[PDB]
Each structure stands twice: as structure tokens, then as C-alpha cells.
Enzyme design. Structure first.
Site, PDB file in Angstrom:
ATOM      1  N   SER A 153       0.894  -1.248   0.026  1.00 49.72           N
ATOM      2  CA  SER A 153      -0.153   0.015  -0.056  1.00 49.72           C
ATOM      3  C   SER A 153       0.734   1.293   0.062  1.00 49.72           C
ATOM      4  O   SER A 153       1.692   1.583  -1.191  1.00 49.72           O
ATOM      5  CB  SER A 153      -1.139  -0.016   1.174  1.00 49.72           C
ATOM      6  OG  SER A 153      -2.417   0.759   0.580  1.00 49.72           O
ATOM      7  N   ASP A 229     -10.495  -5.763  -2.760  1.00 48.06           N
ATOM      8  CA  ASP A 229      -9.608  -4.538  -2.032  1.00 48.06           C
ATOM      9  C   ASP A 229     -10.552  -3.359  -2.105  1.00 48.06           C
ATOM     10  O   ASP A 229     -10.706  -2.860  -3.371  1.00 48.06           O
ATOM     11  CB  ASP A 229      -8.320  -4.526  -2.533  1.00 48.06           C
ATOM     12  CG  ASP A 229      -7.527  -3.342  -1.935  1.00 48.06           C
ATOM     13  OD1 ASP A 229      -7.841  -2.559  -1.496  1.00 48.06           O
ATOM     14  OD2 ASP A 229      -6.263  -3.743  -2.014  1.00 48.06           O
ATOM     15  N   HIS A 262      -7.434  -6.286   1.124  1.00 46.90           N
ATOM     16  CA  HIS A 262      -6.256  -5.245   1.149  1.00 46.90           C
ATOM     17  C   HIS A 262      -5.564  -5.753   2.369  1.00 46.90           C
ATOM     18  O   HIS A 262      -4.436  -5.154   2.666  1.00 46.90           O
ATOM     19  CB  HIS A 262      -6.949  -3.951   1.456  1.00 46.90           C
ATOM     20  CG  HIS A 262      -5.750  -2.841   1.377  1.00 46.90           C
ATOM     21  ND1 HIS A 262      -5.173  -2.344   0.303  1.00 46.90           N
ATOM     22  CD2 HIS A 262      -5.416  -2.144   2.558  1.00 46.90           C
ATOM     23  CE1 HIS A 262      -4.172  -1.659   0.496  1.00 46.90           C
ATOM     24  NE2 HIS A 262      -4.314  -1.218   1.926  1.00 46.90           N
TER      25      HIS A 262
END
Length: 283
Positions: A153, A229, A262
Site C-alpha cells: 500500500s 480490495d 487489502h
């Protein structure tokens, strides 16, 4: 109060896992003007053979703890005999500015060198990760002088930006769920505005998409992205990055995984493949 010191490093945690040692150390980070913690996993190595190092950069809201406790990576680092360093994600301390939002301030350093007050004093995570921390790692641990980088991320953003900008510094780069065009999505617009100011031209040096447009290249990269996600359509926008790479003739291995989100449940599911990927470049 069981203390252990090795020069600038203070040992905070040590735990055996898969035959190796998961450590957490603290040190004074000159580049950040604060105390920092970082994790290092050392595969079993009685002879102190030099090993390659993978840096794992973590995302928003994380410390060094999330990856070392939830990724399950140590099994694979042991298998491949590679050292893995997991730094923290921002400067820390009551003297370090913060913001209650999860996307700004502590645990949200965005792997850049901030120029705006009051962030400039401590938010120099790019310098810390590129220069200061590796120097410490190489001083104290049995490394072979080679390193690779990866992350999740905000950390995938960091890994790719560092690899693109520093070329020979990194043997390989990969990412989970990276923020690929931070200038164009809310997480990067907000943080950049705060840390770097309103001149968006200053953001380009910390934006993987932009760097590839500018002509920066890596020999290759692997990206894994979950299709469930929640941030894919809003913050990550992997498809846009693919188009940039194609236009630039930057090779890219990108894998979209049905059903995966995620979270560290996704990361755990493929981290072994990433460890194997980098290990081949670190012999």
C-alpha cells in the site's frame, strides 16, 4: 528490565521462529530526529555467512509489528536464507507532529522528505529508508551488500519510488496493493499537500506513475493486487499504472487475485512468492 545494547542499537524484542531470530531494535534516527524501532529477521547462520537483505515497507496505520506478526514471512525467509528488515512507517514521539486522521501524520510518513512545517523537522522517511537505516543494518548484521525492497500500500508506493529513483541501489522490487499514482488519488493528494505543499510539481519525484512517465525504469517489478480490495477503485487504480508502464516500455508483472482483499490475510497468501522472487536476485 532486561536490556541489551549493540552500539547505537537497543534490543527491544527477540523471538526464535522457524529456526531464526525475529528481533526488534530501537535507535536514534539522525535523519528523523527521533527514536525509531525496526524489525530484523535473521535466518539461522552460525557461521555468519553474508546474506542478502529484503526491506519490507508497511502501509498506513502500521508499525513494524503488523508484518512481523501477521504475514507469516519468516518461514520463507528461513527457506531462502535471506535477512528481512521491516522498518516503521513514520517518525514517532510526543515531540513529533501528528494528525488524528489515519492517512496523515504518524504511521503515515509516505516515504518522502517533507518540506513544509511542522512536518519537515521529522518526516524524512525517504532519507531514513534509503540511507540511514541500511547503513546501520550493514554495520551490525551479516549482509552481502545487496538489497531488494518491497511493501504494501503506502509501503508499495515507497518501495517502487525508492527503486525507480535509486536504480543500482536495489536488485529487485515488488509490491502488494501499492498506491501507484498517489498524486491522483485522495491519500496522496492530502499527504503531499500537507508534507510538500500545493505545488504538485514537487510531488512528481514521489509518485511511481509519474517517475515512469519521466523515464525512470527498473529491470522488472512484481505487483499483486486483490480484487476485493475496497481501495482498488479509489486509491490504487492499478490499471492506470499498467497503461503508463506499457507506454514507457517498462516491463511489469501484475497479478490480480479474485476474492482477496487489502489485508494481511492477502499478503500472507503470497508473501512466500515475493520472498522467493527477491531471493534469486540476492545471492
Amino acid at each position: 528490565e532486561n536490556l541489551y545494547f549493540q552500539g547505537a542499537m537497543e534490543l527491544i524484542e527477540q523471538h526464535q521462529i522457524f529456526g531464526g531470530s525475529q528481533q526488534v531494535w530501537a535507535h536514534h534516527a539522525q535523519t528523523l530526529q527521533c527514536e525509531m524501532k525496526f524489525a530484523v529477521y535473521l535466518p539461522n547462520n552460525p557461521e555468519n555467512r553474508p546474506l542478502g537483505v529484503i526491506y519490507w515497507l508497511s502501509g498506513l496505520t502500521c508499525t513494524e509489528q503488523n508484518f512481523i506478526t501477521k504475514s507469516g514471512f519468516q518461514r520463507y525467509a528461513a527457506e531462502h536464507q535471506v535477512i528481512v528488515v521491516a522498518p516503521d512507517t513514520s517518525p514517532r514521539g510526543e515531540q513529533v507532529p501528528n494528525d488524528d486522521a489515519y492517512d496523515l501524520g504518524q504511521s503515515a510518513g509516505f516515504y518522502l522528505n517533507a518540506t513544509e512545517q511542522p512536518w519537515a523537522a521529522n518526516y524524512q522517511m525517504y532519507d531514513y529508508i534509503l540511507n540511514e537505516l541500511p547503513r546501520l543494518i550493514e554495520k551490525h548484521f551479516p549482509t552481502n551488500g545487496k538489497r531488494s525492497i518491497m511493501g504494501h500500500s503506502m509501503g508499495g508506493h515507497g518501495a517502487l519510488v525508492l527503486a525507480l529513483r535509486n536504480q543500482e541501489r536495489y536488485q529487485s522490487v515488488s509490491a502488494f496493493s501499492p498506491i501507484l499514482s498517489p498524486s491522483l488519488v485522495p491519500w496522496g493528494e492530502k499527504a503531499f499537500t500537507a508534507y510538500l505543499g500545493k505545488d504538485r510539481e514537487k510531488w512528481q519525484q514521489y509518485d511511481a506513475n509519474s517517475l515512469i512517465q519521466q523515464g525512470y525504469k527498473v529491470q522488472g517489478m512484481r505487483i499483486d493486487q486483490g480484487l476485493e480490495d475496497e481501495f482498488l477503485p479509489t486509491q490504487l487504480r492499478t490499471e492506470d499504472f499498467i497503461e503508463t508502464c506499457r507506454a514507457a516500455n517498462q516491463p511489469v508483472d501484475v497479478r490480480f487475485h479474485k476474492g482477496y482483499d487489502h489485508s494481511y490475510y492477502f499478503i500472507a497468501s503470497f508473501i512466500g512468492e515475493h520472498i522467493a522472487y527477491h531471493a534469486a536476485f540476492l545471492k
